[PDB]
Design a binder for this molecule. Sequence first.
Ligand code: HEM
Ligand SMILES: [Ca+2]
Ligand SMILES: [Ca+2]
Length: 306
Amino acid sequence: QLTPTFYDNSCPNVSNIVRDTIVNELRSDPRIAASILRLHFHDCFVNGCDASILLDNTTSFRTEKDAFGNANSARGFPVIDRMKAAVESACPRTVSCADLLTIAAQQSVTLAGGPSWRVPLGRRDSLQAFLDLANANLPAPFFTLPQLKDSFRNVGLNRSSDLVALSGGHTFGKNQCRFIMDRLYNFSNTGLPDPTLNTTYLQTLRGLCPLNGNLSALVDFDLRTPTIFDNKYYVNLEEQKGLIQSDQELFSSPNATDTIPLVRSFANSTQTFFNAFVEAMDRMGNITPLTGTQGQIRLNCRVVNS
Ligand code: HEM
Ligand SMILES: [Ca+2]
Ligand SMILES: [Ca+2]
């Protein structure tokens, strides 16, 4: 069983070392908190939160970094290396990369203004990476609500609250134009924009992402508070201002009878959202972890110990 006090004796300063690393990085890269939270999400959705995503290529297995959902998208790996080195110095061979990334995600959320809580710990590191599983398990922005629900259920998160609350991770961070081009100019081969996208916001997005323009250009997930972790993400959905298809579907899908009330509840109360986010985050962090003597305490998060 995972427990929040796992390192209280072996490395009581781990959370502080992680926080310091992120605070320092945020000065030069204001996007790092969002990036780190996302790394944890992509770690947990592939064989569980086992730091499998941090592994680099080997001649026996491919890195998850080349998955469709990670390639030219996932970022912040060197920052994780930095905090890992710092933690290894303070507490040699004690904190797993899986746990380190979980703490980093929570601290990132808190630093960005979100809730503060102690995450369950005791996870251990994978002995391999899973590229095919990552391509199969990571959801995509073009997924329908039924597909989003399927993706979450596939990894063990059955609750619509899990999906609606965790999607709140899009209250900050960036998204490439490439992922919304269809919504802006030709949605579902209709030759028309996605009707669930507010027409005024549509104009703004078209200006940021012109047809035949730079598909790698970045746009903010939350037009209200781009870098602050808050419940504004849901207020946007209520106004048809969710950035990607998967965001807006939580409020506009024909299958959203169960998610609409959740979106409203989170938009109406920061407390309700924050409580749900912590609850869902801990559930996601409890997805098929390696514990006890299973796996290792990886020394270099990029390679399995030898
Ligand atoms: C429900 C399905 C989800 C889909 C389809 C999805 C999709 C995406 C996409 C397309 C991007 C843009 C990537 C890029 O342009 O490079 C992204 C970024 C991001 N996602 Fe999600 N996401 C989902 C769930 C989540 C969850 C559960 C979290 C975390 C709790 C999360 C946190 C983030 C963050 C913070 C970013 C910004 C990262 C950065 O700026 O570096 N996402 N997501
Ligand atoms: Ca993983
Ligand atoms: Ca925000």
